[PDB]
Amino acid sequence: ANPEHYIKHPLQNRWALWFFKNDKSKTWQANLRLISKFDTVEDFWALYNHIQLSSNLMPGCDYSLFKDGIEPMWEDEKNKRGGRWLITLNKQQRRSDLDRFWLETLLCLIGESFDDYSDDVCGAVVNVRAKGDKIAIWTTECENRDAVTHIGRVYKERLGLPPKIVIGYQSHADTATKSTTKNRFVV
Template identity: 40%
Template structure:
């Protein structure tokens, strides 16, 4: 895993985000594992985490919580929409209830495809509190599918499951 960038302003975020390939441009499409960059590397995940938090279970900030995850087969346009919505929700802090504090550590999308395109979308949080977890999950389901046309909603309705990190 390699850090591509870090940012502290909205302007910096958009400067980087607009120049990083969409996940559908680098993940397995059912035909080939795509290779990118001068070293011809296969990209298997995109991560967005708060500064100082590694996208690893062993990071002390992640050990106290877990992740909401969804393993899914999505069309490329839907995958891009869901990832963009999740990224914007994480940096805009719209997934969290202001009364319960900041619990979101970061998000990942992983290419799990071998013989067909399958992806895993994750939201990592620092708590196992049932009430906080459920509020975040409910917001996650609403936010991630924002902008999805109604005719695509039934097939692509997010079904997140919980996994503890300890």
Template identity: 35%
Template sequence: MNNKFDALKDDDSGDHDQNEENSTQKDGEKEKTERDKSQSSSKRKAVVPGPAEHPLQYNYTFWYSRRTPGRPTSSQSYEQNIKQIGTFASVEQFWRFYSHMVRPGDLTGHSDFHLFKEGIKPMWEDDANKNGGKWIIRLRKGLASRCWENLILAMLGEQFMVGEEICGAVVSVRFQEDIISIWNKTASDQATTARIRDTLRRVLNLPPNTIMEYKTHTDSIKWLLWWVQSLALELLHAVNTAKSINQ
């Protein structure tokens, strides 16, 4: 499974300039070559529906992340840990990815699948997410695979009917429970968040007493900062205690 999630590595091989007299010319040629390579790479990475395929309204990207439980991560370490699986532009391309992916119920440890519109990273700080929030549903073990599939099919099929508000969805596999969430751009738009909630209840066929929590990304960031500060204070207290004992 590791190979599936490893990011593709670009070929960074290149000739070094060895002739000082021709260095300016060679640097210019090298810059042009790298620019051509970059443009060619960009063209290769553009994802479009194939012939006779059914295009989606937006392109989407699958991501995967895994981390050590009980340990908060900084934005930088989180970004380094999350791996891009691939981007698709049509129904057929989606199924080619999805049919080869492990189902959430079969994941182990502290793992997450993310499905976001192309160009939006599954991070609170992303420009598309920073003013938004997410609906969170906690599931007992055994329900994640079915709920995740129903959620992403509803998202790809534009069933939420809230324009461009939807950013993406996440399924988080934990030891005691699993969590699914759907992210939107504008946390302050109560009418939109209410429509997302009602659609979520319908597409997941949730019982009326199901607890659904809406959390803004601003609150999530504040909570993370509080957690980090608490751990720092505990560590400082432990260090001071050890010093007093040694004295």
């Protein structure tokens, strides 16, 4: 039997998709829910095609895609010393860019797009918010300047962002202890 004709295409990592819905009745951790996991190309698309586009979520929702075993929270062992490359969208870009950026971000993750530094990647998060949406790739160590910088440059190019745009990298330790947070790095 030729495996090319019937086997699914395994991804390098198993990934977990999480959903968050704002409910002021509950703690933030209590609002976070794991949706399902996948570790093949075919199961990724089955999941993606089943769920709402980010642009159709009510305000205050997040999606997070993280490597299996890493919860999408600062407190996780693999995030607490890490940080994130932040894409900040204005209100008009929810129409133009939110969904295509998020899908490109998903592919950067599952397709292992950062060469040897894809091991520093933990996951990605999209925040759907009335004041402006955000997409971010989370990495495991905010001090690994080489890995962080490589991921930032590849990511910015893969999104198609012009050089008129600067994106910033922020430590979670800064984000947790704080409206805005300083950048450690920019590309």
